[PDB]
Design a protein around this ligand. Sequence first.
Ligand SMILES: Nc1ncnc2c1ncn2[C@@H]1O[C@H](COP(=O)(O)OP(=O)(O)OP(=O)(O)O)[C@@H](O)[C@H]1O
Ligand SMILES: [Mn+2]
Ligand SMILES: [Mn+2]
Ligand SMILES: [Mn+2]
Length: 321
Amino acid sequence: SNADDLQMIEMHELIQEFYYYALTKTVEGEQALTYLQERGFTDALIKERGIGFAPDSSHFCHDFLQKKGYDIELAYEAGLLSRNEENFSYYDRFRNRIMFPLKNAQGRIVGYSGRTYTGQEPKYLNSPETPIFQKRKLLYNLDKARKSIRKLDEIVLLEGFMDVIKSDTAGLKNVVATMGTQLSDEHITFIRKLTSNITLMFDGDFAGSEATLKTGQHLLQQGLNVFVIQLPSGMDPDEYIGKYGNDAFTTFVKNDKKSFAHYKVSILKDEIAHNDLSYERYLKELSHDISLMKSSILQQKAINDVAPFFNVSPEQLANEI
Ligand SMILES: Nc1ncnc2c1ncn2[C@@H]1O[C@H](COP(=O)(O)OP(=O)(O)OP(=O)(O)O)[C@@H](O)[C@H]1O
Ligand SMILES: [Mn+2]
Ligand SMILES: [Mn+2]
Ligand SMILES: [Mn+2]
């Protein structure tokens, strides 16, 4: 029910204040606080994002919610508590982790992502699916990013909410991330209401490239204008910012932004030039890709940019399309 959803949100927003205190003031939170500070989190940024610490007792959140008069089973359904199925007892889902509030599109806290700071697995532990937290619907930072996304007519998609936090403070405001999932049909429906331009900046590794191609292809097929920023090998946006600084990052992002078709053929360059079977298949793929582009201006430019990779004239490629 809507009333229960609201109670679940309240539980999240109230425990947030306690996690924040635990992180910033208490003895047990000191090591987690140092960890964040060493990753460049200022006191201001920690306060701004409402970041906190979940103690290791296993009954910190449980006891707080109980004292405040919440139904414990509802707190379990809200994904704040876990249940020992053997004796039906409840305990904290999040223990000894740095707590990042996850806000819905309306800015209400509906879940958490808890990061280890001691090399434990999983590195990030999220809320489970609940009536108020659904990974296929939530986009980290969307609440804050919406204004600039509309103003700039562009959304930028990163892999990690940590990348989003760092990019945002660096000056790149129109950024969001999924909670570690593939961009959903639902996400895409939300996004197209805000803008038709989406820029993918995944990590600069093989996995990120594969994800860029798969996600980009689907976005393109869905009628969006897709762009790609390619980070240096082995780097994500947080690592780039840490090594080169904010101004370098915002300049980098603004300098090399390529239409998806151009990015794709550049990735396939060597295979196309060495394997005639791939040459033919990718010439047809890229022809199809370009034919999907809704922007007549960008479609014409992509033709010019892609043709050389096949050693054909832009006129020949235009004909193939
Ligand atoms: N095996 C996995 N299963 C589910 N989600 C994952 C997995 N690996 C990564 N993710 C999610 O994808 C996003 C990107 O992961 P990645 O490890 O690159 O994060 P990150 O920002 O590098 O983390 P950190 O900088 O804190 O080490 C993260 O937010 C994470 O939640
Ligand atoms: Mn990766
Ligand atoms: Mn990363
Ligand atoms: Mn990282």
